[PDB]
Design a protein around this ligand. Structure first.
Ligand SMILES: Cc1cc(C(C)(C)c2ccc(OC[C@H](O)C(C)(C)C)c(C)c2)ccc1OC[C@@H](O)CO
Lengths: 242, 11
């Protein structure tokens, strides 16, 4: 019988609040980034580097609040964040993504991003096409905020990331979150929306591994010309590579 | 060698 324990409602309450403390749906800090230019070879690189850098900071803030994450070694915390960052950024961006025009709508036209914006940061359709496909299939799940925050947390605490030490520890933390998610859908997600919802959510994590790979490829090519590398941030260089 | 990520992670 599907029962959401005390522990499980606690986990969801913590992850919701963690998300609330690290995602500002008013997008007010965007005015601090180097300004967007849509005139234009890699004209969007400065602005989008800043947006991603900022996003990395919020992801790290969210990760620290994941129940059990604290119990990991600093080294494993680091490995989980470096490998998952771009994935959790893609996940968290779903909240501003819109199927009307397939863009990310962050409050205003200046901060409304589409495929050509992402191109003008130095990316090709090899990445962007499967990116848009992902966003669409994710948006169509119409996840409860509860499922969304659990999905981000499950993504971060992944035992198979290359470089993990205490995989067994990472696996047990993630299981506690998996089980909370499975149980949540059962108890609080009505059919038909609930049908295979967990398997479809995990499929989105598989999709993200592939997006992560392609992003890495194009980032290594982007960041090889030191003139592009110059336009990035110190946090982006540290987290994505140098 | 991750001073900034380390710093943002600290208690
Ligand atoms: C709204 C938003 C969109 C994006 C997208 C459009 C997915 C994005 C933005 C930039 C991207 O490329 C970055 C590029 O690889 C560098 C070199 C600049 C790091 C990629 C691959 C995706 C990323 C982050 C975003 O912010 C979401 C939250 O973190 C803040 O609301």
């Amino acid at each position: 019988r599907p029962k959401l324990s005390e522990e499980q409602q606690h986990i969801i309450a913590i992850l919701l609040d963690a998300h609330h403390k690290t995602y500002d749906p008013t997008y007010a800090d965007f005015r601090d980034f180097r300004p967007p230019v849509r005139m234009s070879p890699l004209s969007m690189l400065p602005h989008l580097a800043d947006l991603v850098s900022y996003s990395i900071q919020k992801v790290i803030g969210f990760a620290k609040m994941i129940p059990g994450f604290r119990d990991l070694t600093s080294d494993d915390q680091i490995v989980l964040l470096k490998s998952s960052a771009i994935e959790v950024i893609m996940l968290r961006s779903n909240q501003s993504f819109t199927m009307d025009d397939m863009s990310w709508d962050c409050g205003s036209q200046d901060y409304k991003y589409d495929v050509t914006d992402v191109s003008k940061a130095g990316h090709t359709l090899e990445l962007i096409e499967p990116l848009i496909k992902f966003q669409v299939g994710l948006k169509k799940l119409n996840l409860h905020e509860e499922e969304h925050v659990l999905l981000m947390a499950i993504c971060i605490v992944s035992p198979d990331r290359p470089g993990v030490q205490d995989a067994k520890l990472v696996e047990a933390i993630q299981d506690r979150l998996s089980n909370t998610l499975q149980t949540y859908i059962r108890c609080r997600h009505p059919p038909p929306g609930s049908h295979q919802l967990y398997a479809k959510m995990i499929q989105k994590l598989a999709d993200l591994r592939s997006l992560n790979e392609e992003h890495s490829k194009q980032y290594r090519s982007l960041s090889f010309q030191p003139e592009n590398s110059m336009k990035l941030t110190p946090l982006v260089l540290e987290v994505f590579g140098n | 060698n991750h001073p900034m990520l380390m710093n943002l992670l600290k208690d």
